[PDB]
Amino acid sequence: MVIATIQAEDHSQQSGTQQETTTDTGGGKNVGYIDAGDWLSYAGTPVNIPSSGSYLIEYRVASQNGGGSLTFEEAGGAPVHGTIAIPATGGWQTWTTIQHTVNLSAGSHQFGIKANAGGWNLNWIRINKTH
Ligand SMILES: OC[C@H]1O[C@@H](O[C@H]2[C@H](O)[C@@H](O)[C@H](O[C@H]3[C@H](O)[C@@H](O)[C@H](O)O[C@@H]3CO)O[C@@H]2CO)[C@H](O)[C@@H](O)[C@@H]1O
Ligand SMILES: [Ca+2]
Ligand SMILES: [Ca+2]
Numbered sequence: 001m002v003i004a005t006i007q008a009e010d011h012s013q014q015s016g017t018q019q020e021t022t023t024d025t026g027g028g029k030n031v032g033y034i035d036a037g038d039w040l041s042y043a044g045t046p047v048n049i050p051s052s053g054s055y056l057i058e059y060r061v062a063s064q065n066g067g068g069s070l071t072f073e074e075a076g077g078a079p080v081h082g083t084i085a086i087p088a089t090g091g092w093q094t095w096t097t098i099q100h101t102v103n104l105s106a107g108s109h110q111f112g113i114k115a116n117a118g119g120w121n122l123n124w125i126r127i128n129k130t131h
Contacts, residue, residue, distance in 0.1 A: 001129045003055065004047045006111075008122040012044025013075075016115075024060065024095040024123050032092075034068070035118035043075040043110040047127060052106045054130045057082065058099045060123035062089050068120035072102065075112035086120040095123060101130065 009019045009029040016038030022030040031040065049055070057072055066088030073080040081102035089096050113125070 003049065003127040003129060006042055006045065006047075006125045006127075008040065008060075008124055010045065011040045011042055013041040015039050020121075022095075022121075022123055023093045024062075028123075030062070030121045030123040032121045034115045034120055034122065036115060038115045038118070040113045040122075041075040041110075042112065046108045046110050048108055049104045049106055049127075051131075053103065054101050055104050056099055056101055056128040056130055057084075058097050058126040058128065059084065059086075060095055060097050060125075061086050061120050062092055062095050062123075063087065063120040064090075064092050065119055067117055069116040071114040071116055073112050073114060075110040077112070077114070083116070092121055 008031040017031050018033050019029045020032045068086035071083050084100045
């Protein structure tokens with residue numbers, strides 16, 4: 001049911017953030033120092049959506065104090081697919097997976113993430129079928 005897993009650090013463009021080592025399962029890196037206005041683009045790795053309809057988007061996140069939120073969209077800002085609040089997890093390297101649904105059109109997508117409020121780290125994103 002997995003369409004794509006995208007490691008958050010594997011962006012083709014970004015604004016305002018920096019990579020750091022993660023102690024989450026699998027190791028590697030996460031994106032940190034996320035604040036309002038910051039963004040991540042995955043335009044360099046287009047993802048194919050096989051059919052129009054509902055998809056589940058998952059985010060592997062960590063947050064010391066909570067208060068964060070993001071917008072999932074096409075790279076460049078539009079169309080916007082959805083928004084999600086990012087809860088406190090207990091620490092900067094205490095990880096949990098959050099999710100929401102969005103509608104996506106069939107075909108090739110270039111995704112982006114805009115931080116509306118900071119306070120969180122991001123390890124990876126996953127796009128899944130519902131259907
Ligand atoms: O959706 C996230 C944010 O996107 C920002 O636009 C950027 C795109 O995400 C990014 O992919 C694009 O990259 C260009 C690159 O600048 C150019 O050198 C190359 O030839 O083509 C790439 C596109 O394939 O850059 C833009 C901004 O310059 C929005 O600015 C932001 O609002 C939005 O949240
Ligand atoms: Ca920042
Ligand atoms: Ca990662």
